[PDB]
């Protein structure tokens, strides 16, 4: 359902260092986190998001 | 060895000056060219005989070279075609030979060895600036338009 091109929402689920926030913090459901993890990893490949704050 | 210059030289001297140069420089470059000849009493007196003529002869050729230089600049743009692939990247190349022929085609006779391409050999489609060195002290410019269907 959730799409990786929507970077604005993904910014809320990544820390300042680019880490993917844990589910227990955000409180998202398990199914959506798996989609979320794929989306963030996929944006990183396209450089829509940074892998880490150091480059 | 000691030689006297028959033509202007950048870092060596002007016409008529007797200068000392390496044997290799004179034997391999100056003497084979018309720039200088060995400086001996036989040549010095003989050189003095046409001292005025050589200076006058050299003066007009620079003007003559300049005269043919401006008309080269008149053809500000020249159109050529080559094997151009996708992205405009030319599969082949357009060297001094192709450019030399193009300028003469419906233009002015141009030597194939005095064209200057500092950037490269124009391996990509587009517009490039090619400099021309027609005489030692004068330069010329022209734009080469390269495109293909």
């Amino acid at each position: 359902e959730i799409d990786y091109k929507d970077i604005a929402t993904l910014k809320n689920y990544i820390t300042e260092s680019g880490k993917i926030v844990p589910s227990r913090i955000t409180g998202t459901r398990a199914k959506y986190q798996r989609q979320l993890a794929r989306a963030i990893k996929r944006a990183r490949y396209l450089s829509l998001l940074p892998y880490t704050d150091r480059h | 060895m000691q030689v006297i210059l028959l033509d202007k030289v950048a870092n060596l001297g002007s016409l008529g000056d007797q200068v000392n140069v390496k044997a290799g420089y004179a034997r391999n470059f100056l003497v084979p060219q018309g720039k200088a000849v060995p400086a001996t009493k036989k040549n010095i007196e003989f050189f003095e005989a046409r001292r005025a003529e050589l200076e006058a002869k050299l003066a007009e050729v620079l003007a003559a070279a300049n005269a043919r230089a401006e008309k080269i600049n008149a053809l500000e743009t020249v159109t050529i075609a080559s094997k151009a692939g996708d992205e405009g990247k030319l599969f082949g190349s357009i060297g001094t030979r192709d450019i030399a022929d193009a300028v003469t085609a419906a233009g002015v006779e141009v030597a194939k060895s005095e064209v200057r391409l500092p950037n490269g050999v124009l391996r990509t489609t587009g517009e490039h600036e090619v400099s021309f060195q027609v005489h030692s002290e004068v330069f010329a410019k022209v734009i080469v338009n390269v495109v293909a269907e």
């Binding site: - | 094997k83 692939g85 599969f91 082949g92």
Partner: protein, 271 residues
């Protein structure tokens, strides 16, 4: 495929064959052959300038197109056939204009496959392009060293060359030996590796097999007399000497390259 011979007799126990059913079973292309009389290691003075050469099966040379200057004309692989002059196989290709030539068979080429040579040819195995057009990192064989001279690198059965990098007018190549060398980008190269990669797995199995391909026995230096070889004699098995060639030059470590002309193209040696 590689098949072992059953030990029905000594000399066949260890024989391992490399059988390729795809190779043409008939005679080669007649108008593209020529005489290949053997030499036996003798030079124009009649002296043996290279030992352990002589005899073997008669062979006829067949002209292989190492240059591939037929630009823009596609060709179809008619068949693959045996070539006694080299480890690799040669593919007979028919240009649709009506010309026939031999080329080194790439790794995957088969009868009926299309090939093309030229600057605008597609990036596909068997095609020949200048290395300035081939993508960096591509695996190529039959690599040229001077433009228009013909391929001279990676001609063996399973050899290939990798284009590690390109800059200026030169392309850096990693040769099969591990050496990295510079070559002009205008030189031509053939995409893909040479076929018959299973050539190294064959085992001759017997002395006669070596003789069939013109290799004569090699006599150990230590088995000679002092007058014949530096390793010389000595009653019993005595060596007591640093290994050397028959002419006294040390072996097992001593370098021999002395070409000051071509070091500018050698970015790094094999090791």
């Amino acid at each position: 495929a590689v098949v072992k011979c059953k030990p029905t007799s000594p000399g066949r126990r260890h024989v391992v064959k490399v059988v390729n059913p795809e190779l043409h079973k008939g005679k080669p292309f007649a108008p593209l052959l020529e005489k290949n009389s053997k030499s036996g290691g003798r030079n124009n003075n009649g002296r043996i300038t290279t030992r352990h050469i002589g005899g073997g099966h008669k062979q006829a040379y067949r002209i292989v197109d190492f240059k591939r200057n037929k630009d823009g004309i596609p060709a179809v692989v008619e068949r693959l056939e045996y070539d006694p002059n080299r480890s690799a196989n040669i593919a007979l290709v028919l240009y649709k204009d009506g010309e026939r030539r031999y080329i080194l068979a790439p790794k995957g080429l088969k009868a009926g496959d299309q090939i093309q040579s030229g600057v605008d040819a597609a990036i596909k195995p068997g095609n020949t392009l200048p290395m300035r057009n081939i993508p960096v990192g591509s695996t190529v064989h039959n690599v040229e060293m001077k433009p228009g001279k013909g391929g001279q690198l990676a001609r063996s059965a399973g050899t290939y060359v990798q284009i590690v990098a390109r800059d200026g007018a030169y392309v850096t190549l990693r040769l099969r030996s591990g050496e990295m060398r510079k070559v002009e980008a205008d030189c031509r190269a053939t995409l893909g590796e040479v076929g018959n990669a299973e050539h190294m797995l064959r085992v001759l199995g017997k002395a006669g097999a070596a003789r069939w391909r013109g290799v004569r026995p090699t006599v150990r230096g230590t088995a000679m007399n002092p007058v014949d070889h530096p390793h010389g004699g000595g009653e019993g098995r005595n060596f007591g000497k640093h290994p050397v060639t028959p002419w006294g030059v040390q072996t097992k470590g001593k370098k021999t390259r002395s070409n000051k002309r071509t070091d500018k193209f050698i970015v790094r040696r094999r090791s």
